[PDB]
Design a protein around this ligand. Structure first.
Ligand SMILES: OC[C@H]1O[C@@H](O[C@H]2O[C@H](CO)[C@@H](O)[C@H](O)[C@H]2O)[C@H](O)[C@@H](O)[C@@H]1O
Ligand SMILES: [Ca+2]
Ligand SMILES: [Ca+2]
Ligand SMILES: [Ca+2]
Length: 170
């Protein structure tokens, strides 16, 4: 994949999440009621090939998009986060999502989802005003591929003066 360099911004739109009502084991999230999803997201510009968790970016650094109780199996989300690349070159950017079912103080993993942005077909657009959203991407769960988070992304060059520093923080 081609090296994308310059100063640019990536927007990640989390459209919806289909838990199918199940934990990563295939069991239902809960026995007598629906999943209680906490859904978190991160644009990983630094460690796209590394494992979920501390090897790439600690879960505490993700952005919380949903924190809800007894939701339908298909959770409509439409929240968006963004992150900038400031003079470094990248070949792959990993859109990362983690969904868990809350069980009081304990987490019940639904899945981790990772989708890569690469620049061969669709490199960053000239600027924000002309940048087009990707089609919805059906991003499969790492543990249960039939669980999908639907994602879209945009990316576009921005003036260097407007580029925001960031870190995976481990
Ligand atoms: O038509 C009004 C209705 O449309 C919803 O969204 C529909 O398409 C989105 C993709 O953006 C899917 O995620 C939904 O499953 C589908 O219903 C709007 O988002 C919703 O707010 C409106 O009620
Ligand atoms: Ca549970
Ligand atoms: Ca529940
Ligand atoms: Ca629960």
């Amino acid at each position: 994949y081609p090296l994308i360099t310059g100063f640019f911004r990536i927007e990640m739109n989390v459209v919806r999440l289909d838990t199918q009502g199940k934990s990563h084991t295939g069991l239902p999230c809960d026995i007598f009621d629906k999943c209680d999803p906490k859904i978190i997201a991160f644009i990983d510009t630094e460690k796209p090939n590394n494992d979920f968790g501390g090897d790439s970016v600690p879960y505490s650094n993700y952005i919380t998009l949903v924190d809800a109780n007894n939701t339908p199996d298909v959770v409509e989300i439409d929240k968006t986060i963004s992150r900038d690349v400031c003079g470094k070159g990248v070949r792959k950017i990993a859109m990362r999502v983690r969904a868990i079912d809350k069980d009081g103080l304990n987490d019940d993993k639904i899945d981790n989802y990772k989708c890569h942005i690469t620049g061969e077909r669709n490199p960053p657009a000239e600027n924000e005003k002309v940048a087009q959203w990707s089609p919805e991407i059906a991003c499969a769960g790492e543990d249960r591929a039939s669980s999908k988070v639907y994602l879209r992304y945009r990316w576009y060059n921005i003036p260097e003066s407007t580029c925001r520093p960031s870190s995976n923080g481990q």
